[PDB]
Amino acid sequence: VNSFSGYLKLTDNVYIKNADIVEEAKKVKPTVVVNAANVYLKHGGGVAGALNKATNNAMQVESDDYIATNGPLKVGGSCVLSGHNLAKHCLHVVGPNVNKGEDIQLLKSAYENFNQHEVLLAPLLSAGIFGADPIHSLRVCVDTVRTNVYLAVFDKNLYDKLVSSFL
Ligand SMILES: O=C(O)C[C@H](NC(=O)c1ncnc2[nH]ccc12)c1cccnc1
Numbered sequence: 001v002n003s004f005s006g007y008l009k010l011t012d013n014v015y016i017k018n019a020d021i022v023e024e025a026k027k028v029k030p031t032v033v034v035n036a037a038n039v040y041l042k043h044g045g046g047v048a049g050a051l052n053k054a055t056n057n058a059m060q061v062e063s064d065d066y067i068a069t070n071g072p073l074k075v076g077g078s079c080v081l082s083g084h085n086l087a088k089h090c091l092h093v094v095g096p097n098v099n100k101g102e103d104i105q106l107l108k109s110a111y112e113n114f115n116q117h118e119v120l121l122a123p124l125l126s127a128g129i130f131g132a133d134p135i136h137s138l139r140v141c142v143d144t145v146r147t148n149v150y151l152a153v154f155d156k157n158l159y160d161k162l163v164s165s166f167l
Contacts, residue, residue: 002119003028004150010166014142014149018159021047021123021152022054025086030150033087034114034122035059036130037094039072041079046129055084063092075102076109091117098131107137111144119148124162128155138162 007015017024025033036047041063043052052059062081073079078093095110096102110125124141126132141149153159 002148003030004121007150008163010138010151010163011142013146014151016151016153016159016163018154018156019152020050020154021121022050022086024121024150024152025051025083026054028121029087030083030119030121031088032091032117032120033083033089034120034125035090035092036123036125036128037073037078037092038097039075039077039094041067041073041092047123051086051090054086058082058084059090076106078110078113087121091120093125095125095130095137096132098126099129100131104132104136107132107140108144111141114145114149115147117147119150121150121152124151124153127158134158134162135165138166 007017010016035051043049043060073094075094078091081090083090093110093113096104096106107126114120124137127134127137
């Protein structure tokens, strides 16, 4: 039994809610919140900008030190950093940004990072401003992640679309 509540059960291991991932994190304080990152960990807008804003820019400060030491992530890759005031840990996962020309086949690789954590609060990778088909991303999530994932879908109309079309 965990602290996630009000989520629709989609599958044996995937739950979904129409909610802002930032607000869910402050309420639940999960062990792991997933950030929809870019390879440079530049958290300017979208999910990343919103999480970072909620950390008072501490996420960005930590991320800049990480990049200075380690260089950029790979598309499809991840790193574990602090969750600051939102979670114990933040798993920064880079899904392909279709609006940047990044290959959509890497979405499965991106979701595989979730399997290293028993329970996660996570956004729909590559959806929204990342430019990929959100129905497809959900199919990849359900077909790739085996650990317990709680998905927070921000856009109300998107959420309604995803539930009503889920196979
Ligand atoms: O679920 C959605 O609608 C799409 C989701 N977007 C957000 O979660 C989001 N976007 C902008 N501002 C925000 N503030 C708090 C949350 C948030 C998303 C998923 C993957 C990549 N980029 C975006």
